[PDB]
Design a protein around this ligand. Structure first.
Ligand SMILES: CCc1ccc(C(=O)N[C@@H](Cc2cc(=O)[nH]c3ccccc23)C(=O)O)cc1
Lengths: 253, 253
């Protein structure tokens, strides 16, 4: 069985494309101005600019994930292997899920650029400056630095076509299921709203949807939205997920 | 100085899951079965059983967290809270309670439940008040509620479909009665109530004629969950910058 899910709430959504203008001042000192803003953002090799295209989750986004994980704990769902997209937001999410499972120390996360979302969405001709696992583990994030990626950064393409994405996802997935096959029977993926229809489209075996009813079906996926597949029967299908959803509204006004 | 802090309760069960939420988290024999991770681990039993919840519903999980955070935040600022009262709505007592829990003062501050801080009653459904849990019952639920507090406006003395002018007037008399009963016993006061409260309790406290009702309601709608204002004595009182930061997040989406 397989579990894919979307990341916590984003700081660049709640607070705007001009959000660094509300954290940071002249000398690049972080200054929180809302309570949903972390108390420290971690320091980045490149400097504060790497956020602009690689934003971290908000306080409530963490909680979203720490709750999902606690829920996994309560439902006696043992998670054997967890892989996440190199997006900062997808790493911070995954680390909190594990806190909730109380496995921040035991489990160690496979980072995998193959899980990232359709680069059509990236601004400009350039990818976000992802933190390399050595530097993520560096900020006290239970990450597995050893894990060699199955689709390296460099091997990815900088504003790709629709069916390049669906194939690299339904390609990366097929690899990850083989990777574990009898090293634990429960793998989770922390990734993106696009990830859920792209990776389990072909796993369950369906015929990918037009580039118009993907975007259709994707924007309808909440934060920490999350889905279950179950099969060596070679026949994978969706199962009612082992936990309940997490619907709240906004702060209001 | 002397200060009066008025803030609005947290996230409402019956806003995130609708007028018919009870139909979602309660089955036929009457067992509470939570269907969403934003619903609490369990609900406190009422004198009327559960149907008592549909006119006095409680805060959600993220509502609790919203108010645990305000309490964390006041305490981080070395803002000392000398006096907590609150509306008899469950949503406000529970919000009040988590504030104490993030202030690290559940075991020293006792919430003065005061029915005259209930919202304008033209907002109550039908023609009977909501079946508020009495202080003693709240103290019986680990809720740090002062059960000897003698109210200034008792429940029997609250009118039904009352007038805007009534309400502005009881909100003014209550606020002057709370302040005076605290004039020597301590420095800073926290009212936990409704969006209506933040205007209704403070407009005349600062020397002002009160807004017309249509404009009163336009202000009131702009107040978010845990919105939080602030008043300071010059016997006239002035609004001021809160001692803590605002708090914004959005839906789950
Ligand atoms: C499902 C029942 C349910 C849910 C939410 C609410 C809600 O949103 N209540 C407001 C106050 C208010 C109440 C009203 O019945 N009518 C209004 C009209 C204008 C402005 C405020 C109100 C608040 O919580 O402050 C009112 C009932």
């Amino acid at each position: 069985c397989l579990f894919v899910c979307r990341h916590g709430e984003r700081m660049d959504v709640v607070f705007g494309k001009y959000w660094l203008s509300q954290c940071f001042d002249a000398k690049g000192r972080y200054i929180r101005t809302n309570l949903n803003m972390p108390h420290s953002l971690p320091q980045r090799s490149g400097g504060f600019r790497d956020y602009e295209k690689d934003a971290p989750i908000t306080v409530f986004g963490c909680m979203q994930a720490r709750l999902v994980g606690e829920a996994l704990l309560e439902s006696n769902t043992i998670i054997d292997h967890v892989y996440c997209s190199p997006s900062l937001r997808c790493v911070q999410t995954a680390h909190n899920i594990l806190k909730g499972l109380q496995q921040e120390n035991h489990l160690k996360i496979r980072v995998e650029p193959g899980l990232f979302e359709w680069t059509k969405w990236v601004a400009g001709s350039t990818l976000p400056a992802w933190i390399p696992p050595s530097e993520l583990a560096a900020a006290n994030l239970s990450v597995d630095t050893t894990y060699r990626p199955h689709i390296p950064i460099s091997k990815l393409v900088v504003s790709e076509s629709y069916d390049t994405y669906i194939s690299r996802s339904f390609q990366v997935t097929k690899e990850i299921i083989s990777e574990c096959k009898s090293k634990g029977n429960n793998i989770l993926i922390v990734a993106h709203a696009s990830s859920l229809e792209a990776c389990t489209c072909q796993l369950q075996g369906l015929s990918p949807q037009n580039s118009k009813d993907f975007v259709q079906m994707v924007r309808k996926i909440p934060y920490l939205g999350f889905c279950s597949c179950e099969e060596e029967t070679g026949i994978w299908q969706l199962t009612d997920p082992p936990i309940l959803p997490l619907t709240h509204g906004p702060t209001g006004g």
